[PDB]
Amino acid sequence: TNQLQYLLRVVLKTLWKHQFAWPFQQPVDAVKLNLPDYYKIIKTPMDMGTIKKRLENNYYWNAQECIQDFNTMFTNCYIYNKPGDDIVLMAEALEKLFLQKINELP
Numbered sequence: 001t002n003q004l005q006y007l008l009r010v011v012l013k014t015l016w017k018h019q020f021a022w023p024f025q026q027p028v029d030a031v032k033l034n035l036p037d038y039y040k041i042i043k044t045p046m047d048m049g050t051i052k053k054r055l056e057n058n059y060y061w062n063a064q065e066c067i068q069d070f071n072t073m074f075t076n077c078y079i080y081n082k083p084g085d086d087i088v089l090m091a092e093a094l095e096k097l098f099l100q101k102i103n104e105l106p
């Protein structure tokens, strides 16, 4: 697989170039953003920088484990933030695009 190639070359590449991707390209910096409770509430932090490094360095057992990471990134956003927040709308747009690309997964 093949399916992991698609996740790197197609899904990650598409999401990474998107206008709203930049706050998700690296882990949430709780000190810099003044969110001292972030790491108390979110026990499995996830971001596209970590996903990219895992795809490049053979971390994943399979493509489903990578898809789980993308979903954890989105739901961590929905758990920590309020509905309607700008970061939530940015995550929602990325999630919609992610579901489109994942529907054409080989």
Ligand SMILES: CCNC(=O)c1cc2c(-c3cc(S(C)(=O)=O)ccc3Oc3ccc(F)cc3F)cn(C)c(=O)c2[nH]1
Binding pocket: 022, 023, 024, 025, 026, 027, 028, 029, 030, 032, 033, 035, 076, 077, 080, 081, 082, 086, 087, 090
């Ligand atoms: C309830 C309070 N929550 C927050 O304020 C909050 C911020 C973030 C960020 C985030 C992370 C970075 S970073 C990676 O450089 O550390 C930079 C900018 C970030 O968000 C923005 C902040 C201001 C903007 F104007 C626009 C933003 F996009 C990411 N994610 C995944 C979150 O869930 C989250 N919540």
